[PDB]
Amino acid sequence: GLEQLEAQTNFTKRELQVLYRGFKNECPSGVVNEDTFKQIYAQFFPHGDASTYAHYLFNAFDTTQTGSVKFEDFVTALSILLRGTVHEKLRWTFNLYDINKDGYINKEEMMDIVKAIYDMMGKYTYPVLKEDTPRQHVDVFFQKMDKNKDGIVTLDEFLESCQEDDNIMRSLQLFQNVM
Amino acid sequence: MAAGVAAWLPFARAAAIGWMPVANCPMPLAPADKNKRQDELIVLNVSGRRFQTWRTTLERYPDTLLGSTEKEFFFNEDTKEYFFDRDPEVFRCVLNFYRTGKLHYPRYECISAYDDELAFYGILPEIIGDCCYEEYKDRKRENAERLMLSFRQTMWRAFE
């Protein structure tokens, strides 16, 4: 219910109704799926292809195991992603990086996500493009989010070395008060 | 939050998060907050008839009359309702487009009135939803059709 969704999320009533308006304005509140995000998520990012990344945060987004979850489960995570706490954003990004759905990630798995990022960056890189640094930008990533040097990340191990990245600290909640 | 043209920016502000931890780059850009206020159902009075809609729904296309800011030549502060002395039934389609973003054609309209009201509100008769397009051209062409010396050339004119 409307009130049943308010007390769950952090947003307010005006925000929730004015957003459900735009929610229905593109999909008749049936349920949002892959194909609608691959165009909403792309319609704000020219010179790039945003489908491949939405393909990950949609399955991390879907609380159920269906191919299209809900509007209620849409807002219950929109709250966490906009005004939610930092450490919950980190856990949800943990659910996102873990493509194998287990809680255990190897090099190529999360490298496939850093591809999507650096793929939708553009067709021609504005500085010089180097394709082995996607091997290294995850490599230099490893030495941070790993204290065992085995090749796997678990939630605590994957978080215990981003908690002090102050730039991502002030940058992860930039939209928790801007309406 | 935002609506009108920014109806789906919240999903973007949610999805931006997924690059923040992996942002091994020194410094991204802080947000662009500003003054804040909610929308309101602006109320149009077209010839006694009343319509209402959020202001962002108006601002969606400022290349029109109401979409722009110059609707105030008809804003009656005496009423606080923008009053227009045009037909509302043809304006009804315009409003509905403003809501949806596509226009259509009431088949039984004397195409003259439809077109000149379109022009009146600054609308493009070309961007009609092609789902209803050719009949518009048919009305166009049928209406177009509907609206359709001493001695030397004396014999001439006498001939034809």
Binding site: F45, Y118, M120, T125, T133 | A6, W19, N24, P31
Partner: peptide
């Protein structure tokens, strides 16, 4: 314009590839 600000900001925060 107050719209190019927000939309351009997202692509700016995107540019952070090294």
């Amino acid at each position: 314009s107050l719209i190019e600000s927000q939309h351009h900001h997202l692509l700016h925060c995107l540019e952070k590839t090294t």
